[PDB]
Design a protein around this ligand. Structure first.
Ligand code: DBJ
Length: 126
């Protein structure tokens, strides 16, 4: 169902959170080789989460679940804010700008933490 497909997507989001927090530790420790690999892993995870989210939104629409569509439109928009911050973080790493990297890293943390009250709302609406 769309509800099990959303729990699958929720798990992929949790995986990115787990990898994000080991990446943050690696950045702080100056282990740049690990950061590089973790950032590639996060990209692949965020790409996947976004595809599951689009499929879920398209399905809620075909199902006429107005509330779930509203919530998923709001959630997909904020997901894109996070993705832009992520891409900027990645660019900061390539550039060697640790000041920008730290900034974007803190910003992504807060965009994702906010999005959780909506994430939890979607689960109950689908
Ligand atoms: O819960 C997932 C989530 C919520 C809010 C913002 C996000 C995000 O994941 C990718 C980056 O941006």
């Amino acid at each position: 169902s769309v509800k099990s497909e959303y729990a699958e997507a929720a798990a992929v989001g949790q995986e990115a959170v787990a990898v994000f927090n080991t990446m943050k530790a690696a950045f702080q420790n100056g282990d740049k080789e690990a950061v590089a690999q973790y950032l590639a892993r996060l990209a692949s995870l965020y790409t996947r989460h976004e595809e599951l989210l689009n499929r879920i939104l398209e399905k809620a629409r075909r199902e006429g679940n107005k509330e779930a569509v509203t919530l998923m439109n709001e959630f997909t928009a904020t997901f894109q804010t996070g993705k832009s911050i992520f891409n900027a973080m990645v660019a900061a790493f390539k550039n060697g700008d640790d000041d920008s990297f730290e900034s974007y890293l803190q910003a992504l943390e807060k965009v994702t933490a906010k999005g959780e009250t909506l994430a939890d709302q979607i689960a109950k609406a689908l």
